[PDB]
From a paper:
[name] and [name] form a functional helicase complex ([name]/9) that plays an essential role in DNA homologous recombination repair for DNA double-strand break. [name] and [name] proteins are structurally similar, with an MCM domain at the N-terminus (NTD) and an AAA+ ATPase domain at the C-terminus (CTD). The structures reveal that [name]/9 is arranged into a heterohexamer through a threefold symmetry axis, creating a central channel that accommodates DNA. Multiple characteristic hairpins from the N-terminal oligosaccharide/oligonucleotide (OB) domains of [name]/9 protrude into the central channel and serve to unwind the duplex DNA.
Unfortunately, the density map of [name]-CTD was not observed in the reconstruction. And the 3.95 Å structure of the [name]/9 NTD ring was reconstructed with C1 symmetry, in contrast to the structure of gMCM8/9, which has C3 symmetry. We also found that the structure of the [name]/9 NTD ring underwent a large conformational change when compared to the previously described [name]/9 NTD. As a result, the two conformations were designated as Conformation I ([name]/9 NTD at 6.6 Å) and Conformation II ([name]/9 NTD at 3.95 Å). In line with our observation, when superimposed these two conformations of [name]/9 NTD, we found that one of the trimer interfaces in Conformation II was expanded by ~5 Å. This expansion further pushed its neighboring [name]/9 heterodimers to shift to either side. The left dimer translates downward by ~8 Å and tilts by ~6° while the right one shifts by ~7 Å and tilts by ~8°. Interestingly, the ZF of [name] shifts by ~3 Å to the left, and the ZF of [name] shifts by ~4.5 Å to the right, resulting in an overall expansion of ~6 Å. While in the Conformation II of [name]/9 NTD ring, the OB-hps of [name] and [name] lose their C3 symmetry without significant conformational change.
Residue numbers in the entry:
A (entry chain F), C (entry chain A), E (entry chain C): 63 to 369
B (entry chain B), D (entry chain E), F (entry chain D): 1 to 276
């Protein structure tokens, strides 16, 4: 196009806006991180099976694998430090990077089939790639549940615990398609932490009208399977302080992660703790703030499952 | 779904109906109640053999294809009406629904596990034993909300996606911009029998044998509609042929919104009954 | 007949305007049917006793006998189909027929009794007719509870069932005395199904004031006792698979019907099926509407086997 | 109502109560508390015999007749106050009450079972065993309201809404319309025994020995006014003479209207004591 | 002139402001009564201890002793009638007389010290004794719990009761510092009752600002310990039928009286009865609010404690 | 609360902490985490002994003195930070907390019974047994409020004694202050770990030995901040030394303020583990 010679060169995803709410910035550290994650992913792609990854919509990656891969370590000196300070940014960077490797792999797929069998199109073929999000498991710190406090909030942490409870899968709308009343264009809006929100301004540049229509029916809306697991630290009675119940921290699963959890089984969940929604401080402005930490699982790793 | 193709798909169904459903048409003539919901049972595999296009189309858009089949059924009924010596003697039902049976097995077409959000909009066959059956309720399929100034909106369908509830719109429903302060729902004061539709939810539960030992079987609500309602009984394993759908709780700003997986069932055939 | 007194007299039924908003017309189909019912009612002098109609505000008609009569058959080719097609309209017209007879009969009786005394005892004669509802029982077309459906709704149905429970009698305001603030005048205002409603404007042409005050103290409000019975289809092994749940449908009972049947007793209940709002989300009717099928029962007859 | 006749009723009552008053009148000076309000019990049958018109009026307008009776009692006390053996000995009570006993029995007048909607708004006699009695409570039976701008004092008695609530007056008493959100009260200004009068609530279960065992047992609220509070003993048969009246919850638009049959007791007599 | 001298000339006591909000006037009879009570107190000064009264913040004065003293009898024939008719004014008056007597005794001691040796005070102690609530014991009229009623409220009475239980002491805001937002001027505002109140009137007469801000942190706010206790009617088989329902009155025990009572110990209570609005009041918010009887014990004498 | 008195007292406090608790300050600095407020223990009786005047100031105005105490530990920590050879080994501490122990015996200074309102606002030693321990919750002790109109960033703490509820200030505290009708605050928009502090509630009641015979134990809320939370165990007796600050729900006009004496837990000792 006029703006960029290659759609990919200017923006890693050709459909950048739908995939990423954030706009591309050359200056921003996140784009460099995406490149490092991508390079690591390209090296690990041969091990990965493309078809399996495409159906899953997610790829499980060990934190140990991430640390071992050279490019990520070179670009950001400590992956772990980066994860605690900006958990969302790093997780998103990882997801875009794997998705980009997959888009490139899809382009490669088209090229190889065209070479193998003569095609009328012979190139010029649209390639369809499902959204892929990186999953991180076996995060190194492995902090205990008792340690978690107000300071711990906002930092990506790994929790060692046994889930005792599971919840029935509930589809959660990661993105809700929104059509402004005065504009033909409809754009999906990411819901922060799967929580309903309305953009003040319409995404389309030509019309900025506030009013929106929620197109749940439309394919543009994205629904991701979501699960909730209550995970409690497990300790020997002698090891634990006597007379105090083991702390239980709510954890959640998304996409392919869901349904890999069975109650009574020890599963390590790695992800970012978040201040609890629907609590009195959150619900009411000018109210006493009472909050609890709920941690998403970037990846699911089950010690019991591995056995 | 190209429009010209849609007529062609209907034509293919109509020819298939003549050979396959002469008996079904005789049954349709025998029941004289058009308002009562009635089912014509079509074996999917034979129809798919007659038209390759129809088979592919059904998989991508089951709801649209079912609608085409229903339109063809009305056309088939009028031709049968003409063929019969007395048009009056043969009875044609407005509520005639093609019921898909004997689907060729495909992972998408027949999936044993409880359906997921990814599978929404795709036909699925799941054998289901229902743990809980809710009481029958009637919720209007279409509500006659009318914008008085516009004079153009009648029988607007209730939105299934929003928890099977229509939402009254401040903006005029019709494209023409003639907003009115007063919106009147004819259905709300008095509902026509056609306007309303039966609504039921059954908690289809995964069979224990299918699931791994020590793992809880998943349970999903299944919509039962029209003639199919009440055929299923709790504690009975019946194959459910249906298209998956999503039901959304009303959204609230700054709080999480809940989406619930659900399946609308096109056809109900009980495997337990088949086993006999 | 511009004057209200003259119009009421000219019209066959004096209190009909209060009972029904709809205005009878010669062109309208309902009126010929009320005439047919009136001829049938007069022929069945034994069936209708004026005191009985006055006391309970109702009459009970065996449907089979009603269909058998030639006059209604002349008016409608099948009386049964019409009852199914328009249960409310047929009921209103049937109610009008008994009511017209009641108004004429009461007035005639008063005139005959007081002729010797004076012109109607030298005083105004007021009918003071009770609200009249036609109750039809022994309805020949019979529908089982499983059969009842959305298409069945809006048509009269006959079912056999056992009443699970009876509600405590609750006053429900059929009418509400309403004083427009500008008018300063209290007018009884019909409340649909004993559900609170506010008049948009004062009925009188002179006053258009929106504000209205509901005066409980004022005599104009009418309160009617309300009872609810739940009816469940009798479970028989021949009729249904053993253990099939009986469908349970609520019955709204008002006026004479209240406390009609002792619970735990099987009865034949004949009524027009109606829809009521079980819930509206959390008080948001426009956003969420939930309707639950229930059958309003015009007449409850003890089951023949029980008798 | 012109109420000229009701006022005449009060004058007839004064002559009728003169005999009751002397026994009641004696010791008023003797009574230590002038503030204390004392009930005077007058037989309902006795009032009916003294004048048919007063008895019929009591049946027709019980609340109005009772207020007139209380004013007449105050007037009679004034006459008694005028003549006394010793000025210091005489006790004068500002507040006197009329309590009715031995009311005439008619099927409508006395009902063991729950009063119907037709019965509502009429005096009723209930025979029942009280299931529960709430603790003695106080209510602002009379509240002074003074609009700050108007600067005139006006008082309105509380209406029979749930909790016996009152509504602030739209206009000032002295020939003007003035509305104040804050209405000054005599009780607020200085302690006033008159403003606060005790109220009690009890629920009476109708006698279990109904003609039909099947008919549901019914519980009816009974409201005690002024000196009547705390007279009843829980778990005992109680004979209550009272005006049954509508109790109205605040009406909500498009919500089914609910009203309740609640008796406000003119007098309480213990049926268990009569039996024993 | 400051007017301090005029204030001293019209009333010897300068503690009147603490005792009552009302600006004092010479015409009011309370000052004449104060002189009479104070004269009796001068006779009783030897019996009384100045230090004890000052630390206690209250004086135990017999109802009988006041009645016997001649000067008080001359001013008011019986103290008891004044006490019931206006309990608060009399209590303040007796306390003020005690304050005047106590201050005068101290002034005399300082004057004597000045005579013996040069004194910085040189007489004029300016003790500014804290408000003393006179506690009158052995009040002749006795009121039982059953006897107590709405009519009794507003009358000082002697009540005998048994404490069912003692609730946790809760601070009651006797006074609240209030700062006019515009003025920036803080006035301690006595809260009329426990319920929060705002004074529109400014402390300065010349500059008036309606807007006022509550200032609990400021020292002007005074919180007085209040003990909520419920006293059942004393139950004796000879006195009343066994199994009779107890009459229980909630009681307020402010200031020195807090915690004087012991649960399960019979205590003779002499106090004003003040009706208290129920906190819940009418359940649906209404102009009307429900009320419950309450008593504040001006004097507590423990019958169990002292036999 | 004289400014000179607090300045003088602060200098003495700094000297006292350096002479006795320098090692403790070093230990508090040493732990790698600096985010939690860190306890620094001081002994009251010795402070009174060293300077008579400062001890009296502490008795007279403990809350202001406590802020000075806190500033003194922070300043002493800064001098210690300059002194320590290795920054890594002894980490800089973001925040510090102050504990006062060993109050000199006085009836007011140490009371077994719950603190009275007369002595509210004064440091005292109480002995209590924990009945209830609330689960740890995240509360932001300091909440950022930003004047949209003046574009100035300031921090306003959630008011203690308002049940920890922050209050919007339309006018900014700073000299460049413009009243803002609508407040846009980044801190309000996004929760921050630094803004939040650990909050727990401890209910402490008198020990059986402690309570007077025949008297119910009285329980007072204890507010624990940061490090104090989770130290306590339910069913474990605690010796709590703290200033008592009455805590109230925000009041409404004509509504009684529910205010309870609450002892801020300035110092926590386990009575059950050690009597002293």
């Amino acid at each position: 196009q006029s703006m960029q010679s290659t759609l990919d060169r200017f923006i890693p995803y050709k459909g950048w806006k739908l995939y990423f709410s954030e706009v591309y910035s050359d200056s921003s550290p996140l784009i460099e991180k995406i490149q490092a994650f991508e390079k690591f992913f390209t090296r690990h792609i041969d091990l990965y099976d493309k078809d399996e990854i495409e159906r899953k919509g997610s790829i499980l990656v060990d934190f140990k694998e991430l640390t071992e891969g050279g490019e990520v370590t070179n670009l950001i000196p400590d992956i772990a430090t980066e994860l605690r300070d900006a958990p969302e940014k790093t997780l998103a960077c990882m997801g875009l990077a794997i998705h980009q490797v997959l888009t490139k792999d899809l382009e490669r797929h088209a090229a190889e089939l065209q070479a193998q069998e003569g095609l009328s199109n012979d190139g010029e073929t649209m390639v369809n790639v499902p959204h892929i999000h990186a999953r991180v498991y076996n995060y190194e710190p492995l902090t205990q549940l008792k340690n978690v406090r107000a300071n711990y909030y906002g930092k990506y942490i790994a929790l060692r615990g046994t889930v005792v409870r599971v919840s029935n899968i509930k589809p959660l709308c990661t993105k809700m398609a929104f059509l402004c009343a005065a504009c033909g264009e409809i754009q999906s809006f990411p819901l922060p932490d799967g929580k309903y929100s309305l953009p003040t301004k319409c995404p389309v540049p030509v019309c900025r009208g506030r009013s929106f229509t929620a197109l749940r029916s439309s394919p543009l809306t994205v629904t991701m399977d979501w699960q909730s697991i209550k995970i409690q630290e497990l300790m020997s009675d002698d090891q634990r302080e006597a007379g105090r119940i083991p702390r239980t921290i709510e954890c959640e699963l998304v996409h392919d992660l869901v349904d890999s959890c069975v109650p009574g089984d020890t599963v390590t969940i790695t992800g970012i703790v978040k201040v609890s929604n629907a609590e009195e401080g959150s619900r009411n402005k000018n109210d006493k703030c009472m909050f609890l930490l709920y941690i998403e699982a970037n990846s699911i790793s089950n010690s019991k499952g591995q056995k | 779904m190209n429009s010209d193709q849609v007529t062609l798909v209907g034509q293919v169904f109509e020819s298939y109906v003549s050979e396959y459903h002469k008996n079904d048409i005789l049954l349709i003539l025998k029941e004289r109640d058009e308002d009562a919901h009635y089912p014509v049972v079509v074996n999917a595999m034979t129809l798919f053999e007659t038209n390759m296009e129809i088979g592919e189309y059904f998989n991508m858009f089951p709801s649209e294809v079912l609608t085409i089949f229903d339109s063809a059924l009305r056309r088939s009924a009028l031709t049968i009406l003409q063929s019969l010596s007395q048009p009056e003697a043969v009875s044609m039902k407005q509520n005639l629904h093609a019921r898909i049976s004997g689907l060729p097995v495909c992972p998408e077409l027949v999936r044993e596990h409880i359906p997921k959000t990814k599978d929404v909009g795709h036909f699925l066959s799941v054998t289901g034993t229902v743990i809980r059956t809710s009481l029958v309720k009637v919720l209007e399929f279409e509500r006659d909300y009318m914008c008085n100034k516009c004079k153009h909106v009648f029988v607007i369908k209730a939105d299934f996606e929003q928890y099977y509830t229509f939402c009254r719109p401040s903006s005029c429903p019709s494209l023409e911009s003639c907003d009115s302060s007063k919106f009147t729902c004819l259905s709300g004061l008095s509902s026509s029998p056609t306007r309303c539709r039966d609504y039921q939810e059954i908690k289809i539960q995964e069979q224990v044998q299918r699931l791994s030992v020590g793992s809880i079987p998943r349970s999903m609500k299944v919509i039962l509609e029209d003639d199919l309602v009440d055929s299923c009984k709790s504690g009975d394993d019946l194959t459910i042929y249906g298209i998956v759908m999503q039901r959304w709780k009303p959204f609230q700003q700054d709080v999480r919104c809940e989406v619930e997986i659900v399946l609308k069932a096109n056809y109900i055939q009980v495997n337990n009954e088949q086993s006999s």
